[PDB]
């Protein structure tokens, strides 16, 4: 279920210069492009080896788009400041996520386009790719303008067309990394915390993509509410790490098993603490 | 590739 996503950030900074526009693109959990208008001569830069297979026109054209976006989001920030009757002295941020989910037939499974203002939902393209959900009265102004401008029709064409076509292209150009799931390396540790309790921590290291399920079971019963589960974290080499811990009564450790589900595993793993 | 052109909010 591959996907392509772009994440846009535009932040106003009155007095400290023009609004800053940042764009990053992802195929699944792999970042492949970056644009930051804060550079002296801003350019789109590669963030994955396979995107460097594109020719010079690709980079020039992406830079043109993102440079234009820098100017367009400056106007959008002014518009929203007017919608909310906000002062010209405060700093505000627009965030946006959009992209396509690839179905098994090589065509669009689901399209996405969501925006936020100051960290709160603002407007979103509905699943039919033909209508919008506005969060508040201000976003209903954007909705009316985008209904008349037919923005949903533009987005639907992109999501069903170029987004799918170029995601399939990237998946091919980098299939030796993008289409190779890396299974986690796994082990279980044991730490006493009292005379009668101990910590069982189940580790998953070096896996890709980030999607994974680590669960503890006691006599085959899920221990979700009792499990400390840290956020999946990046290793720095495009792989990820995660662990799950449970505090158990001393002497029950054999009743506890760790279950690891990941795309790179031939079969789901069942792990125990082995003294 | 990104959306080729952006509308103002």
């Amino acid at each position, epitope marked *: 279920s591959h996907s392509m996503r772009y994440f846009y950030t535009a932040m106003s900074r009155p007095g400290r210069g023009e609004p800053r526009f940042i764009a990053v693109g992802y195929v699944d959990d792999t970042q492949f492009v970056r644009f930051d208008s804060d550079a002296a001569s801003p350019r789109t830069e590669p963030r994955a080896p396979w995107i460097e297979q594109e020719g010079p026109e690709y980079w020039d054209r992406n830079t*043109q788009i993102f440079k234009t976006n820098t100017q*367009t989001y400056r106007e959008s920030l002014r518009n929203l400041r007017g919608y909310y009757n906000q002062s010209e002295a405060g700093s505000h941020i627009i965030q946006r996520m959009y992209g396509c989910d690839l179905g098994p037939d090589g065509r669009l499974l689901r399209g996405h386009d969501q925006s936020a203002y100051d960290g709160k939902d603002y407007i979103a393209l509905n699943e039919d790719l033909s209508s919008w959900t506005a969060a508040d009265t201000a976003a209903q102004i954007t909705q009316r303008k985008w209904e008349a401008a*037919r923005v949903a029709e*533009q987005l639907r*064409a992109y999501l069903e067309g170029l987004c799918v076509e*170029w995601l399939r292209r990237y998946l091919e150009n980098g299939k030796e990394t993008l289409q190779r799931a890396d299974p986690p390396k796994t082990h279980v540790t044991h730490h006493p915390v009292s005379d009668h309790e101990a910590t069982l921590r189940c580790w998953a290291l070096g896996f890709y993509p980030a999607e994974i399920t680590l669960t503890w079971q006691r006599d085959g019963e899920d221990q979700t509410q009792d499990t400390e589960l840290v956020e999946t974290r990046p290793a720095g080499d495009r792989t990820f790490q995660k662990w799950a811990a449970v505090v158990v009564p001393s002497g029950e450790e054999q009743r506890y098993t760790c279950h690891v589900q990941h795309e790179g595993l031939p079969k789901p793993l069942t792990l125990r603490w082995e003294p | 590739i990104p959306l080729t052109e952006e*509308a103002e909010l």
Partner: T-cell receptor
Amino acid sequence: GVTQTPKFQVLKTGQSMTLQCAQDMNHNSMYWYRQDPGMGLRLIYYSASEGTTDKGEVPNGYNVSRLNKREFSLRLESAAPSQTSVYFCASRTRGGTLIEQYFGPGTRLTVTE
Amino acid sequence: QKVTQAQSSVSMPVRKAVTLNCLYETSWWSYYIFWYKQLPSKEMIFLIRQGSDEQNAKSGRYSVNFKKAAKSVALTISALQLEDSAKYFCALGEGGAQKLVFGQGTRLTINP
């Protein structure tokens, strides 16, 4: 819509002339094109918004200035017979699908020796 | 050339239909084709647009036969009126900038 002045102009070779354009549609993208008789339009300069003119993208013999959001000017610095043309200004919105360009009524300009 | 309108002049009786051809060349992954008509006053009138990611355009009496692989984008005008006599231009707008590249146009004469 898009307005242009003057509608007609005759110039002697070597004279200067400034053409004026305005659009009241809240657009940002504006354009100068020229049309020689029997031909299509050819781009002179594209102004995506207010800002300083990129002189490296301005064809020889012309100066352009984006005065503000509405107003866009084109100057022939030294009129030559080859610059006899119909000069069109245009504007458009960005985003969505209704991005076709609106053309002004044009300036029909003849340069004679 | 980057936009080619091979028909220099076309005549067609009133109330019939006519197809005006247009060929283009581009390496952009995203573009629009626009059809305009020009009056003897030199006024330019927008007719119909065709996006590279869109199905065949249709707007009233105007329709576009978009053959993307062949980069052909012919305009058909049905139920012709005398007012349709004009010079018709095919224009390519590439990418974000939309710096239009025009064909040389085709003079259409509707005969009463």
